# Entry
Amino acid sequence: MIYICGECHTENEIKSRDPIRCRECGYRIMYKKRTKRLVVFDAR
Amino acid sequence: YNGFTGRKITSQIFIGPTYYQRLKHMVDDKIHSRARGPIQILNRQPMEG
Amino acid sequence: YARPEWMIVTVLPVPPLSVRPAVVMQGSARNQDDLTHKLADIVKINNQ
Amino acid sequence: SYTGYNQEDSVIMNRSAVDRGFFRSVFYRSYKEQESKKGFDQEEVFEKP
Amino acid sequence: LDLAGPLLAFLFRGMFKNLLKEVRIYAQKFIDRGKDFNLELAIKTRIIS
Amino acid sequence: WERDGAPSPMMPNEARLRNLTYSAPLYVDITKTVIKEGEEQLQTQHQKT
Amino acid sequence: MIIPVRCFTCGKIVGNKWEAYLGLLQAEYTEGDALDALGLKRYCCRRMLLAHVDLIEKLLNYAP
Amino acid sequence: TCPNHPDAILVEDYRAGDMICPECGLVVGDRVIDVGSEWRTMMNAFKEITTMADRINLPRNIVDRTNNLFKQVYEQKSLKGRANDAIASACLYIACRQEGVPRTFKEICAVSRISKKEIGRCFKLILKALETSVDLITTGDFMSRFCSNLCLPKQVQMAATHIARKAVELDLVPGRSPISVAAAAIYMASQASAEKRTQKEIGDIAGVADVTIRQSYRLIYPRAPDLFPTDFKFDTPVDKLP
Ligand SMILES: [Zn+2]
Ligand SMILES: [Zn+2]
Ligand SMILES: [Zn+2]
# Structure
């Protein structure tokens, strides 16, 4: 569960219960990291 | 020339570059079907589900 | 089929539950229809 | 008037050009959901049921 | 043509009159009670916002 | 203003992302004068109310 | 946003000509002269570079 | 309720809004599920509570928690005799404390129309009535706001946070209110760093008399260096401070 800060782009593991916030930046906009699962694209 | 047969078309076709636009209206955004769907509880009549 | 006395509302009918249903909102909090609220007012005054 | 499929304000598009990205576009739909704690009894949270 | 400014100025006077009316009402209650009133508390900030 | 109450400049993108209103605080200098029919006048000014 | 790989009309490769095309223009070539230097004879392919807008350049001005 | 399958868990279907036997296919209930609606796919106090919260700009969720607390204590009525503005201020303080962004009573009396004494009285009364509790305030709670109300940088803010946390750790300030320790630590980190602030401004912001800032600054005055962050830039030597 890695969230990327919108300000400094820091990857920080955030639990569901704890508040959503950059650990060092303090920014309050967080983006989920891209899924590790593999998705196939046909180059069509 | 005709693509299917390769024969010259008798009329000469006006052809050249023109600026075209794709509009927001797509058919997928519009196609929709209803067949024994989720009626309303109060009115007992069709509604979106 | 009709009498002048019948025009006076001596006994008030109560619409079925189908006519006025119990809507569900914000979970299990049953949202009574407007008719039920008026019916609740009617019965309260009627009992009083 | 190639094959009658452009009649009445219709258009015949090149499939090969479409295959090459001709008028290809992206559609972005954004969905917003907020969790509200209003009401002591009810407290909605984000988690997979 | 009423642009954003003049349109906004139309709202502000109505909303500012309510603000001035509100402080008059708030102050009148305390003055009649015999106690001076706090200006910060008399102003309702939500009226303009 | 954050939950803790710490003010911070609001960028237009953050307002767009967090569904905020791009609003600027408004302050007014208020001068209050009180007369108590005792040949004394007290004039107190609340700067930036 | 970025130069298409193929000309839409004929499928000729165009994705390796945008940088050369910009270089030729910097060399004081006229737009038509640059296209001829790049081997774009059919006006369908000349259309590809003559009408291209390279938005990917400004999209890179935003930090990831 | 499949007639063939007594006690069968019918599966809800969104195609038509009907419940089907999990292993028969028989549709029990024609279109009864109501798919669209189901799956997403006293006063003058709430006015007063919002009036107060706007003066502090605290977010609406705190105001919702405040209104919930007010409704609850207006049902208990174990403090019916108290003024409604007093109950509102105490609820606002309890909500601010519960959310984890606590303010001081002086930061609620500054907004409400009642004295801090009544706020504290009704606060204790409400905690007694609701049979709830609130976690004890720490010094790191008043720092994101005190250092931001002051024009201090984020560096000085984390500095004062570290100083105060270590000072309450090392027992330099026994039994003194966290707000005074916070003000003292902020004064230390401010006089040490580039932007200096006097005792007066910090007293105004924190709501602490400058005498208390002095008293709890002399308690952390001798242990200044080992409280500061190790990696800390400044333009006034931490070895010389008033
Ligand atoms: Zn960050
Ligand atoms: Zn071509
Ligand atoms: Zn069955």
